[PDB]
Design a protein around this ligand. Structure first.
Ligand code: PHP
Lengths: 99, 99
């Protein structure tokens, strides 16, 4: 699609058997999701944004279908008030910003 | 411009007599720029991101020439590490997410 930004760029994602809406984000290097029960081993890692830093669980090689497009990447899980799809996955579904 | 996301989407902006480089961000509702010198009255505002809540000086009606396109809007100035061009100006330069 072509998503104008008059409203938050939200899309449906399917990850670990669950359905969630996530923000398409060019200002996020990483994908960070709300806490869910995602199966597997996870290294600790910490990220920053405004306000500070949060501790997240790094899950790597997770498959996630963003708008029907599938991708596999690292997904950080942690206390975030919105789920975020960052550039590490946005490049796999072929996403470009245009103006 | 068509901008792929392998690299951070940074574009140059000319704001208040000064040259800056900022992040084109579809995950920011607002525009938040590094603490800088800008003329005007401001009102305190507070924004939230991950990790927490920063207090910022809110400015309305500031002209920003983003990637050599002009636009006028509210600009927040405060303790960020990267300047962000959020959706309140991204829609003025006509920007779209495309996949
Ligand atoms: C999502 C994270 C993976 C991403 N962080 C990240 O990429 O870290 C890079 C970094 C940081 C520090 C040092 C070194 C490197 C991140 O925090 N990105 C924000 C922009 C940014 C900040 C710091 C460094 C680089 C870039 P963002 O993607 O624009 C973030 C997305 C988001 C997170 C949480 C909640 C909502 C939305 N927006 C924001 O934080 C804006 N907040 C915002 O739009 O919503 C207000 C809100 C909504 C809901 C609840 C509470 C508050 C803010 C710029 C005003």
């Amino acid at each position: 699609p072509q998503i104008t930004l008059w409203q938050r760029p939200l899309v449906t994602i399917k990850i670990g058997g669950q359905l969630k809406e996530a923000l398409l984000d060019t200002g996020a290097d990483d994908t960070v999701l709300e806490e869910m029960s995602l199966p597997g081993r996870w290294k600790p890692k910490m990220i920053g944004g405004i306000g500070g830093f949060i501790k997240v669980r790094q899950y790597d090689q997770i498959l996630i279908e963003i708008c029907g497009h599938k991708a596999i990447g690292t997904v950080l899980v942690g206390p975030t008030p919105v789920n975020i799809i960052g550039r590490n996955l946005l490049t796999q579904i072929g996403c470009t910003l245009n103006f």
